[PDB]
Scaffold this active site. Structure first.
Site, PDB file in Angstrom:
ATOM      1  N   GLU A  80     117.578 -26.888  74.536  1.00 17.13           N
ATOM      2  CA  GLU A  80     118.875 -26.213  74.644  1.00 17.13           C
ATOM      3  C   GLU A  80     119.404 -26.311  76.066  1.00 17.13           C
ATOM      4  OE1 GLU A  80     118.523 -22.052  73.635  1.00 17.13           O
ATOM      5  OE2 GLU A  80     120.678 -21.522  73.897  1.00 17.13           O
ATOM      6  N   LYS A 264     116.312 -12.733  72.913  1.00 21.36           N
ATOM      7  CA  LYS A 264     116.198 -14.163  72.660  1.00 21.36           C
ATOM      8  C   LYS A 264     116.532 -14.913  73.944  1.00 21.36           C
ATOM      9  CE  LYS A 264     117.795 -18.373  71.773  1.00 21.36           C
ATOM     10  NZ  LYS A 264     118.762 -19.211  72.531  1.00 21.36           N
ATOM     11  N   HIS A 378     128.370 -22.867  78.688  1.00 15.31           N
ATOM     12  CA  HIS A 378     127.374 -23.455  77.798  1.00 15.31           C
ATOM     13  C   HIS A 378     127.872 -24.746  77.150  1.00 15.31           C
ATOM     14  CE1 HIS A 378     123.885 -23.306  75.044  1.00 15.31           C
ATOM     15  NE2 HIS A 378     124.700 -23.741  74.102  1.00 15.31           N
TER      16      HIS A 378
END
Ligand SMILES: CC(C)(COP(=O)([O-])OP(=O)([O-])OC[C@H]1O[C@@H](n2cnc3c(N)ncnc32)[C@H](O)[C@@H]1OP(=O)([O-])[O-])[C@@H](O)C(=O)NCCC(=O)NCCSC(=O)C[C@@](C)(O)CC(=O)[O-]
Ligand SMILES: NC(=O)c1ccc[n+]([C@@H]2O[C@H](COP(=O)([O-])OP(=O)(O)OC[C@H]3O[C@@H](n4cnc5c(N)ncnc54)[C@H](O)[C@@H]3O)[C@@H](O)[C@H]2O)c1
Lengths: 425, 372
Positions: A80, A264, A378
């Site tokens: 990620e 998370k 992101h």
């Protein structure tokens, strides 16, 4: 010096040269990362069972991290994007205030010795408590090497469960002081040796003799301080961002849905460090989430407050069952080199760093989410992957599509549109 | 045919040959696993930020797995031994009774739109519900490609929190029907477009607009049946092993220490499958444990009972936010091949297999712990 200027602009090879000279790595060490195949099939076939190949993941290095005034490079292995960018940016800010201040507790693991068939759990519990030293010595006699290293069984705590579906049962906990080892196998072995004696005392039938991943005795802590002037942007004020973060913290503290996403994000930084060092990532996740659920309510692992001084202060305390002399840790060539880059001497050193990265990671996501959306930073990085989702044939033009869609409107909805702008009219 | 005789005796290469012929993989595909370096640096430098190399992990394949009567090879990437051995052994046993029976719900993810500064949370809540259809249409209008595929925003459920340290806050959930995608980025985007309208209505300040990893609307299920004669050892009897397992289950259901270990076992099987498929392993972990902590008590994800027939029956229901058109899924050469080996056509197909492996993994661990 952890600060690595223009590191993100350097090519993968140029970065590896820079890290090599800095750390003073041998040309043998640098090749493990430069040339693919650092893990020989004969070794790979030794770990897992039905091995047929090997799966690769990017191996990055975060920067600016300062644990107790000592700089340190943090190797991460994840797929990620933004994780490293965020983790490093936040560590950069923490520098101004002294970096990350960490601590930890004695590496205590616990074995569970479940006993069923006792008609008097409550009375049997005292019998084990009076003959506690007798059971303790039996556990140590098993692992002599551990006692010499300063470890060994320390104490025993017996718990009971009278109202159980399958009936009352007694559950004794062996508090073992492992070290530089996650201690799964060490604790499990001690539980097997003691089992016989405990049946002799309580008169029940011992079932499971396994360890507990909820290592609440082996905690690791990390602290950060962020001045409002550091978070101050162009559209938002410094103090404004602090309140935003505080609103986001409260939210995660009361709503389990936000807590699961908040926790998370913390694991986004910890897990990659664990995978790199070849430690069990599932063991870490299990001890973390279960710990967050200790007060009968799933909540935040990290805390965010605003001291009477006006600065944003955060903390992260959570179980960290990691190791140095583990299994795949001594076996995998790169897991070994990762500990070499970290410079850790004890497992607790590794745990203190792990929680520091997690803390840094949470602060990064929160700051973003409170300033203006999360899609701004992101997706800029994730503009490459998403380019592949739209580019059907001719993935060469994907590189160019990424630079064009990077105009603050990056999304597949737009990515598919920009294709015609080049393939035709 | 998933049964692979003497597979564990075969050499890694011999195994790759056997899986190649069976699946009918091209020599191009086989080369991805034969020769190291399947992931080029230019691609690797595309995913993460400060890339300097690549970390490798053993890539295995479990056997015997039968999901709904269809055999399938399960690719796993982990460093801990026994995982594949156990997963495959248990699946072998399941075959005798029909294998694993699975199911799933419509892939529904939800975005949270936190709203602070409202002096009347409770009243504002009704205003968003009455103008629900109006906020819905706004989210869909954003992702056109999703609606054509059968996805899009379905409904909205507003919740309140009057007793909060930072004050009362209103939190709206957009229930989006993603598909074949974990939907993290799709959902977060719909939440950004909707934010402006929600402030127009409630009159508060929207803070966070992020999704929720606790996907309790995107569940996956798996079932197994084990006859006592199958578990029957030399030292222990069939029925004896059944009672041992049940004692182990009850232990995990009442004590959070055993539960953390019990559930870790389940993850030993699911995570390796997620890593292989290039999916986010942290998203799956968060949703799993948080879902185990829903009733205010951390417990088992799986259940173990003894039906009125005498057989051991187990289940595993949990959130499975997985995908096929994701980020690193379409980018990593091996991630793509892993889906090809699986033969899954939808994400829900992948999820169903994921919980099947988990369930198998847990049965295996409990049997061992219960036997000796
Ligand atoms: C990524 C930023 C930092 C943008 O960064 P920016 O705000 O655009 O600023 P910048 O790029 O001008 O900043 C420059 C400095 O930042 C760092 N930096 C910046 N970019 C890079 C890069 N590409 N590569 C390497 N380093 C980078 C780097 O250290 C650099 O230092 P200098 O160059 O001066 O020496 C940002 O938008 C951010 O804070 N993102 C947060 C996203 C995040 O936390 N992702 C992890 C997963 S979160 C998740 O999955 C779900 C979630 C969010 O719900 C979890 C949760 O809530 O906890
Ligand atoms: N877990 C978290 O808390 C979190 C939060 C934010 C982002 N992420 C990351 O985002 C990634 C997953 O997000 P994503 O998969 O939504 O984003 P993505 O951009 O990778 O894919 C979704 C996009 O592809 C398009 N699309 C094409 N075919 C599609 C199809 N068949 N079905 C559905 N959509 C289709 C959609 O329109 C959508 O724009 C993961 O890497 C995850 O780590 C995670």
């Amino acid at each position: 010096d952890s600060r690595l200027p223009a590191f993100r602009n350097l090519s993968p090879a140029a970065r590896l040269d820079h890290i090599g000279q800095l750390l003073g790595l041998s040309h043998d060490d640098v090749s493990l990362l430069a040339n693919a195949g650092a893990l020989p099939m004969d070794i790979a076939n030794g770990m897992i069972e039905n091995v047929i190949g090997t799966f690769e993941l990017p191996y990055a290095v975060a920067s600016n991290f300062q644990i107790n005034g000592r700089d340190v490079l943090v190797p991460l292995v994840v797929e990620e994007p933004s994780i490293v960018a965020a983790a490093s940016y936040m560590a950069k800010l923490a520098r101004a205030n002294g970096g990350f201040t960490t601590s930890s507790s004695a590496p205590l693991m616990h074995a569970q010795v479940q006993i069923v068939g006792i008609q008097d759990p409550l009375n049997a519990r005292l019998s084990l408590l009076r003959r506690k030293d007798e059971i303790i010595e039996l556990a140590n006699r098993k692992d002599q090497l551990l006692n010499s290293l300063g470890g060994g069984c320390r104490d025993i705590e017996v718990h009971t469960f009278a109202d159980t579906p399958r009936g009352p049962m007694l559950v004794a906990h062996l508090i073992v002081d492992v070290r530089d080892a996650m201690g799964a196998n060490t604790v499990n072995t001690m539980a097997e040796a003691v089992a016989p004696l405990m049946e002799a005392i309580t008169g029940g039938q011992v079932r499971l003799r396994i360890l507990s991943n909820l290592a609440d005795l082996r905690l690791a802590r990390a602290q950060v301080r962020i001045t409002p002037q550091q978070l101050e942007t162009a559209e938002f004020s410094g103090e404004a961002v602090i309140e935003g973060i505080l609103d986001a913290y409260a939210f995660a503290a009361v709503d389990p849905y936000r807590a699961a996403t908040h926790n998370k994000g913390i694991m986004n930084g910890i897990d990659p460090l664990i995978v790199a060092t070849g430690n069990d990532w599932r063991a870490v996740e299990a001890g973390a989430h279960a710990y967050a659920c200790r007060s009968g309510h799933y909540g935040s692992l990290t805390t965010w407050e605003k001291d009477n001084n006006g600065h944003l202060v955060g903390t992260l305390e959570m179980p960290m069952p990691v190791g140095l002399v583990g299994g795949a840790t001594k076996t995998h060539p790169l897991a070994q080199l990762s500990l070499r880059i970290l410079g850790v001497k004890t497992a607790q050193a590794l745990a203190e760093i792990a929680v520091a990265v997690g803390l840094a990671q949470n602060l990064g996501a929160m700051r973003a989410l409170a300033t203006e959306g999360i899609q701004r930073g992101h997706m800029a990085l994730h503009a490459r992957n998403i380019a592949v989702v739209a580019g059907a044939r001719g993935d060469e033009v994907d590189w160019v599509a990424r630079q064009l869609v990077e105009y603050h409107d990056v999304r597949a909805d737009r990515a598919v549109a920009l294709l015609k702008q080049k393939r035709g009219q």
